[PDB]
Design brief:
Its EC number is 4.2.1.1, 4.2.1.69. The protein is mainly β. Helices cover 7% and strands 29% of the residues. The structure holds zinc ion.
Amino acid sequence: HHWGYGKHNGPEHWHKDFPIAKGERQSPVDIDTHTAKYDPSLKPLSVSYDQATSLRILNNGHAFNVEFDDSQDKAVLKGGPLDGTYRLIQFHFHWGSLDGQGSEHTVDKKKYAAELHLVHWNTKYGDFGKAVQQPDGLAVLGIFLKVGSAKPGLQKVVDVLDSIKTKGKSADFTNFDPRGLLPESLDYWTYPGSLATPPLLECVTWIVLKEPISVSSEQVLKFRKLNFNGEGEPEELMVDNWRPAQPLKNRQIKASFK
Ligand SMILES: [Zn+2]
């Protein structure tokens, strides 16, 4: 039926409705650190989020998204391997039922407890909808989460989750600053890939940060209390909403560092 992460509609089934799932530039992938090529010509990333305007938080039945005002160049990403300016539209997370799994990308086959995706679209295309149809339309910053110390900047997010427990619920979520979710270092790996949920379009330049951020056990616990289902439906906890690693095929992963 409609796609999800269960036994009957999970990632291994996606190709039936979305044939691009077996495509040549699908994501996520395993990042082999010994085979990644250091590229001296890659520039440092430029993250300008001082003017970010968050608007709302929504449970869409597959994750929760924090949405931003993208009507102007308020929160942008540029530099790195990118040409042009990419506007932040939303961020979401992927997490597991246990601390040993949850991330989409893996590093030398290591899985992290969760993975944050900051989604941005190329302004040359005028809107998000047109950007996903282009090979360089999206830039997604992936940040791994490990369990350790609490991340103060994540607490505002954790605390509103009760209010969007089920699918289709939304809440006003203004004045949230995404700078509170970045690691200290912006060293990264990059490769050409795709959206990791249907429609799985191959329009993403992935930028995966080397340094994970730490969250506490209690923080991640709150994510696992969300529901995949709508209100008044049988309860299905929102856990393990990650797609497994896909074949690298003809692609090279580049590193901004040695
Ligand atoms: Zn994602």
